[PDB]
Amino acid sequence: TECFFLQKRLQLSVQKPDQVIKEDVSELRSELQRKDALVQKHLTKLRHWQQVLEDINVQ
């Protein structure tokens, strides 16, 4: 079944690369969204830790 799916993939790529281009664009968009979300989470955690250090360094 896997080989049948891969043969279908070959025939589709040689018959219609626009679908492959659209899929690549969608994957790139999803990767960009995931990277932005991870960066936002890291920034939130870093700001929380910065406030924690500023409140704890009162000595």
Partner: protein, 65 residues
Amino acid sequence: LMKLVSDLKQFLILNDFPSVNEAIDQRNQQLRALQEECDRKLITLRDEVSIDLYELEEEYYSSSS
């Protein structure tokens, strides 16, 4: 004379020869607690930073086009 004698007595008993050296121990305990809290905070910060760094590496190294 009484005022000067009291002043000299307070002078000699304040820091000249006061057998009470426990103030140094109290300062030791205070500073040690402070530096222990600082070390614990730094350790928690580095642990969180390492977790985030690994989660970020997993997405950076495995994505290129």
